[PDB]
Amino acid sequence: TTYKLILNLKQAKEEAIKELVDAGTAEKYFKLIANAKTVEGVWTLKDEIKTFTVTE
C-alpha cells in the first residue's frame, strides 16, 4: 500500500482483532499478540483464535 512499503506488527495486530471480533474470543489475545515484536507470533496466535480447538 501507499508509495513505499510499510513494515509493522500492526498488520498482525489486526489479523487477530478481525478473527477475534468474528468469533467468541478473549480480548487478552489481541493485546498479547499486538505486544509481540515479531509478526509470526501474532499471525500464529491469531490462527489459534480461528480454531480455538473446541467450540462452545
**Sequential DSSP letters for 15-30:** HHHHHHHHSS--THHH
Q: Cell 499478540 appears where?
A: 33
Tell me the one-letter amino acid at 53: T
DSSP-assigned letter for residue 11: H
Q: How many CB atoms lie within 10 A of CB 9?
A: 19
DSSP-assigned letter for residue 2: -
SS3 (DSSP) at 35: helix
| Domain 1-56: CATH superfamily, name plus number | Albumin-binding domain (1.10.8.40)
Which experimental approach was used here? NMR
Which residues contact residue 46 at a Cβ distance below 8 angstroms, ignoring those fewer than 6 apart?
12, 15, 16, 19, 20, 29, 33
- What grid cell was written down for 28? 487478552
Q: Which of 15, 21, 22, 17 is nearest to 44 (CA)?
A: 15
- What grid cell was written down for 43? 499471525
Cα 51 → chain centroid: 13
Residue ranges per structural domain of the chain:
1-56
Tell me the longest C-alpha to C-alpha distance in the chain: 44
- What grid cell was written down for 48? 489459534
Tell me the one-letter amino acid at 24: G
